[PDB]
Structures are given as C-alpha cells and as structure tokens.
Swiss-Prot record, chain A:
Outcome following mutation: residue 90 to R: In strain: Beta/B.1.351
Catalysed conversion reaction: TSAVLQ-|-SGFRK-NH2 and SGVTFQ-|-GKFKK the two peptides corresponding to the two self-cleavage sites of the SARS 3C-like proteinase are the two most reactive peptide substrates. The enzyme exhibits a strong preference for substrates containing Gln at P1 position and Leu at P2 position
Full protein segment contained here: 3264 to 3563 of 7096
Side of membrane Cytoplasmic, spans: 1-300
Domain Peptidase C30 span(s) in chain numbering: 1-300
Regulation affecting activity: Inhibited by pyridone-containing alpha-ketoamides compounds 13a and 13b. In turn, alpha-ketoamide 13b (tert-butyl (1-((S)-1-(((S)-4-(benzylamino)-3,4-dioxo-1-((S)-2-oxopyrrolidin-3-yl)butan-2-yl)amino)-3-cyclopropyl-1-oxopropan-2-yl)-2-oxo-1,2-dihydropyridin-3-yl)carbamate) inhibits SARS-CoV-2 replication in human lung cells. Inhibited ex vivo by michael acceptor inhibitor N3. Inhibited ex vivo by compound 11a and 11b.
Active site residues per record: 41 (for 3cl-pro activity), 145 (nucleophile)
Cross-link Glycyl lysine isopeptide (Lys-Gly) (interchain with G-Cter in ubiquitin) mapped to chain: 5, 90
Result, substituting residue 189 to A: Does not affect ability to cleave and inactivate human TRMT1
Subunit details: 3CL-PRO exists as monomer and homodimer. Only the homodimer shows catalytic activity. Interacts with host FBXO22; this interaction promotes the proteasomal degradation of nsp5.
Name this polypeptide is given: 3C-like proteinase nsp5
Gene from which the chain derives: rep
Length: 300, 305
C-alpha cells in the first residue's frame, strides 16, 4: 500500500552520462555504444543562438573541437554528424555500461523519469509528464542540457527525451533522441512561448482509481455521466477532453475497483465543482495528473 | 528553474540489491562486500510471526536454508548471524560493485531516497522523509521488505533505512542498517499503530525558501516573530517546534533570498492561521515538509554525484 511519485532506478542511465565541451559551452551527452548524443546547440557561440545555421556551424567544426569526458577519461571524437536537433559524436571507445536500449517518441500525458545532470555527472532523478502543451515542468539549472528522460521496460531503457531549453515561464522543452522537438519549439533564442497548459484528464482518473485501491473513497458518488457531458464540463476547467481510447485504457482499473469509467468521471466532475473541502486524496489537496493508467497499475 | 521532489541517483545502490529466499519467503537483501543484509523476519513462517523467538529460529537454520541470488548468479552463504532486527548472511563472494558506503542512523525530519525492490530487482526510486512519528509514507507492495533508504555524500552511499513492515494505516516502518527500528515498532504480527504525525517545520521553511528562489513570493509579509511566539502558534497546528539549530541551518537560504528565518516564520504563521486562499506554492495547495534545508540548497545549486 501507499502511493508515491516514483521514478525508475537511474543506474542504467548514469552509466551513460558524459560531459561534452565545445568552446566555452559544457553540457551533458548520452554515450551509447560508440556514439555520444547531445543537443546541437553546444556548437553555438551565444551570438549564433538567435538565428543559427547549424549545418554551416557544424561543417566549420573538427573532431578535435569536441572534448568528451566520461568520468576521468577523455574520449576521442572520431566523427560528428547531426540528426535534426541532436548532435552525434562518434567516439573511439564503445561504452561498456551500454544497457539494452531503444529510442522512443512519446505522446502528451506520458510520464518518464529524468536524470538531471551537470558536467556529465548525475545529480538527481525525478518523475515528469510530457504536458499537453509539449513542455515538461522540470527542475533544470544552466548546464543541465543533454539530461535525459527515460522509462524502463524490464531490462531495456527507452530514451524518450533530451533536455534542450527553458522557456520564459520556467517550463522546459526538448527533443526525442532522434532530435525532433516535442512541441512547436526551435533551438533558437527567438521569442518562444508555451501554449496554455491543460490537465491530463486520463491521468487524473487513473490517480482517482489509485486512491480507491488505497482505501480513499470519500469523493465517490452515485452518479454516472455521458462522455460528451463529462468533456463539456472538464474543458471549462482547463481539462483535456477524454477520448474513447482513454475510457478503454482505464478499463482494467475500472474492473479492479468495480467503478465504471463514466461513474469515476462523475466523481471528477463533482471534485471540479466543489473542490476538496479541506480533504486530501492520497495526501494531495490538488488532483494529480502525472501518473498514467500504466503507472497506477504498475505501482499498485 | 523548477522544483521537483528529487531522489539521489540509485545506480550505486542497484548494484547491491539481491534476492534472499528462506523457505517460502522471498525478500530483498543488500550485498556489501561479502555480507548480505536483510530483515530477520525472512526466517519466519505465518505462525512464527505471531510470537517469534528469532535467536531460536536462527540456531535451527543452516547456511543452505538461505538462497541468495545476485542477478542470475546464486551466491553461496557461508555464515549467518543476527544484529538486532537485521540478518547478516556471509557469502563466499565479495560484491565487485560495492560502492564507498557507511551505515548511518537518521533523525526525524531527515530525507532519504528509497530504492523499492521486488525479488532483488529494483523497480522504482522515490524520495521520502522520516516522519516525526518514525514512520515513512512509502509505496511498498508485498515482497518489498529489504528495500533500502540512502543518501549520497560526494561519492559515498550512506545507508539509513531498510524496509520491514506496513502498519494498518498504510504507512511504513523499518530499521537502520544495524537492525534498530526507527520508532516504537517491533517485528512481530501484533497490534501496532503509529503515533499522531506532526509537520516537519524546518522542512516547510526550507520549501518556502525554495518557492521564493523560484519566484513565488505572494506569501511573504512584512512581519517577523520571536522563536518562542512562533513555536507557541506552530505547536497548536501539530507542527514540530523550531530549534535554534533549525534557524542556523536555514541561514544560507535566508542570506540568499534576503528573508530572515523569523521573517519567513511570520509568513508560515499566517499560512497556518489563514490558509492559502485558493493560491498554490510551487504548484502545491499544501505546505510541503519533505525537503530539508540541505535538499533545497542542493537542488537550487546543482550538486552532483
Ligand atoms: C543555451 O541554452 C538556452 C536554454 O534554454 N538553457 C537552459 C536550459 N535549461 C535550463 C536553464 C536554466 C537556466 C538558464 C538556462 C537554461 C538559453 C538561451 O536560449 C536558448 C535557446 C534555445 C535553446 Cl534550445 C536553448 C537555450
Ligand atoms: C513481513 O510481513 C509483514 C509486513 O508488514 N509486510 C509488508 C511490508 N511492506 C509492505 C507490505 C505491503 C502489503 C503487505 C505486506 C507488506 C506483514 C505480516 O506482519 C508483519 C509483522 C511485522 C513485520 Cl516487521 C512485518 C510484517
Ligand atoms: Cl533538517
């Protein structure tokens, strides 16, 4: 019993963190086999940042301009190429600690663990969700670029995010490991803003099921609702619409607790209308939306 | 920017987790050098748990009754002894992944990371605090006993907790790595209950400083208070008393933000007597007490491990 925001054990990713230096910029790289992946903005000279021509900047670089450090050992860069917004530095040594891995692109609402790093060194691990506006609400200081988001599939690490940027509101933007940004962001210092964020409705429902599994039932009610009526109410509270796919995904939790999805939807509608009235759900006074249905099943 | 509940990187601890089986019970062990540490209740059946004589049960066991598995390799138990509520199984092989470590006993209010394991396999890592009632509000299913709590100091893992039990309210109890329970708990199936929990006041203040560092300032006020007047108010809201040591430990955050500790205490007093008024601090509608002053400094300064 109990319910915590839980990250994946970070060991398999820590064995991959390296420091990448180019000129005066130092950030983190992900060393997998004989390739170091890192944000391409490491080759930018501050001025370049506004309207960089990355293909042009990269052609002017040599392998000896890139300084890669794995612990107290300098790795030799023997090649460099760019894949979208990620720079790939081929090195002369394959990482002996390379785990079984894959590169996955995730959808909004999906959760993942972040191993925050500075100078190629792991400082902490936390759990995040990809927001509906494609940002993440991370905890990142200057020097954290190249820190990665991942999930673990038994023995396999699925890398889903690499940190590139912090927006003016303090939220963060990044790419998958193929260098494609999540959201309409660009790796340029041009004026950028995240869209208004919304609540991940399917995740809140998953967390209400987690609360029932843990004995918290005060918010339950005798009502049910249509999916259309639920969406009309939820959207006026900045909640994402719930699709039939989300109803289906919540099926196992519904069968486990004996509370139909639309029945739990009517509880969520009531919580949005009344608030908590001094009560908490799983020790929280706000509805939590960073636990997916898969996270709840795994943890409970 | 940003403020998250952050655990220490778990890699140094993952290399130490093993599966310990004795009879029909399987739980986790911590393999350090040539010793595997685990809860001594692994020797118990459902009957023994009611009233166990652990010294008597252990004398009747042989080394071959304990099955230790590190990954897909079976370790040979060549000795067994008990230290308080922890069982120590001497093995024939020293763990090559043994990090620099130490066994430390933490105080209530101190935080640590928990590497939750099942069958000697790490499944998740989370951050928690040792509550003032000596329980932890963890997340543990059956099979998680032997999971450990730790902190990292430079490159040294300080093991501070081993999981043993879940109380009827869903909160958890365990021991340090020398087998001494945190709190008035015992390792027997007998009616047990945690004392009334209180809020870790110094940690709430540390988190209010974290909010100010992140630009959340609405709760700040012009007032200050005496430590005595603050403690009189705080204790009527089930808050732990704030000591001069807590005031001193908050000093670097007070210097960084320009908000004296007793000035922040007057903000906390108002938040208690009046509530948040529909507002949040760091995205939370409740005052968070599981960040120590050291955690806030470490996170708002990027200390690495
Ligand atoms: C070069 O890095 C930038 C950045 O966002 N960095 C950061 C990323 N994370 C946390 C940060 C905390 C504090 C300070 C900067 C942070 C700053 C300039 O504008 C840009 C423009 C584009 C890109 Cl892809 C990055 C960047
Ligand atoms: C050893 O098992 C006990 C236990 O608490 N185990 C658990 C520990 N964690 C999470 C659990 C989740 C769900 C079910 C049990 C959990 C239950 C029987 O009585 C006792 C009595 C004493 C002790 Cl020290 C442990 C125990
Ligand atoms: Cl403290």
């Amino acid at each position: 019993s109990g319910f915590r925001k839980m990250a994946f054990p970070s060991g398999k990713v820590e064995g991959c963190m390296v420091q990448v230096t180019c000129g005066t910029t130092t950030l983190n790289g992900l060393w997998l086999d004989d390739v170091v992946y890192c944000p391409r903005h490491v080759i930018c000279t501050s001025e370049d940042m506004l309207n960089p021509n990355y293909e042009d900047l990269l052609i002017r670089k040599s392998n000896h301009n890139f300084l890669v450090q794995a612990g107290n050992v300098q790795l030799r860069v023997i090649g460099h190429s760019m894949q979208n917004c990620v720079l790939k530095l081929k090195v002369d040594t394959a990482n002996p600690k390379t785990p079984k891995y894959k590169f996955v692109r995730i959808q909004p609402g999906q959760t993942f663990s972040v191993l925050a790093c500075y100078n190629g060194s792991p400082s902490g691990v936390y759990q995040c969700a990809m927001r509906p506006n494609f940002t993440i609400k991370g905890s990142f200081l200057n020097g954290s670029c190249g820190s990665v988001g991942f999930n673990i599939d038994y023995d396999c690490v699925s890398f889903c995010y690499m940190h590139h940027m912090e927006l003016p509101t303090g939220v963060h933007a990044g790419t998958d490991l193929e260098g494609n940004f999540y959201g309409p962001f660009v790796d340029r210092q041009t004026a950028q803003a995240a869209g208004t964020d919304t609540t991940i409705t399917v995740n809140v429902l998953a967390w209400l099921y987690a609360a029932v599994i843990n004995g918290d039932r005060w918010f339950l009610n005798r009502f049910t609702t249509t999916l259309n009526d639920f969406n009309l109410v939820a959207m006026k509270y900045n909640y994402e619409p719930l699709t039939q796919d989300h109803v289906d995904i919540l099926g196992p939790l519904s069968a486990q607790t004996g509370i139909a999805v639309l029945d739990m939807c009517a509880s969520l509608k009531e919580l949005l209308q009344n608030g908590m009235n001094g009560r908490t759900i799983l020790g929280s006074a706000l509805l939590e939306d960073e636990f997916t249905p898969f996270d709840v099943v795994r943890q409970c």
